[PDB]
Every structure is written in structure tokens, then in C-alpha cells.
Design a binder for these strands. Sequence first.
DNA 1: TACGCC
Length: 19
Amino acid sequence: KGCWKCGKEGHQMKDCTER
DNA sequence: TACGCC
Ligand SMILES: [Zn+2]
């Protein structure tokens, strides 16, 4: 539930600052 | 930034 890369919900990869 | 960054 959220971003897997950094750990910030609201995005996942595209939209992260990392991968 | 975020824009795939793989
Ligand atoms: Zn993220």
C-alpha cells in the first residue's frame, strides 16, 4: 500500500524521486 | 524536482 522504492504513499515508481 | 530513475 503506497510507494515500494522510498516508502511514500501517493505514488509508486514514475512519480517517486527514485526508480 | 520527479521528469520511470531500473
Ligand atoms: Zn517513492
